[PDB]
Design a protein around this nucleic acid. Structure first.
Ligand SMILES: [Zn+2]
Ligand SMILES: [Zn+2]
Ligand SMILES: [Zn+2]
Ligand SMILES: [Zn+2]
Lengths: 72, 72
DNA sequence: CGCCTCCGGGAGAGCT
DNA sequence: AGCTCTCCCGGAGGCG
């Protein structure tokens, strides 16, 4: 039921991991677009439905840590 | 709204032709399967929802004649 | 960003 | 086994 990256309600198993719609699309864009992000805090930011936009850096890291792979 | 091959409820436009979902996957498998297929009747089998299973030979023939190709 | 639609295709459950 | 067919998830394209 819950997204392993932000804990919004999960919409399926995406790129390997139980994930919400928005994190699926975010991850795809993050890898393909080869953006390189930057944490403005400690790399410890809180990623939930309310704060996930704030730190793409930590959100992307949480994505990686959950095991998201573009070709799972 | 009706599959151009078996007249079941069409699920959209697959490989060029308005078809149902089972005709989509059947055609793909037949083409790539490099398949013999011999009709047990006289190449005039009735292909509908309840009968499309019996004769791959006619189903495939009907698929091709409907314009299904693995390009579009 | 977060969401939509559309169609391709993997997979696995279930015949046969 | 081989075949059928639905469920689920992929990319592309587009949108506010
Ligand atoms: Zn999420
Ligand atoms: Zn951060
Ligand atoms: Zn059909
Ligand atoms: Zn036949």
């Amino acid at each position: 039921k819950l997204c392993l990256v932000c804990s919004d309600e999960a919409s399926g198993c995406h790129y390997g991991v139980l994930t919400c719609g928005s994190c699926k699309v975010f991850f795809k864009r993050a890898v393909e677009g080869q953006h390189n992000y930057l944490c403005a805090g400690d790399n410890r930011c809180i990623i939930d439905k309310i704060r996930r936009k704030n730190c793409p850096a930590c959100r992307y890291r949480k994505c990686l840590q959950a095991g998201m792979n573009l070709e799972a």
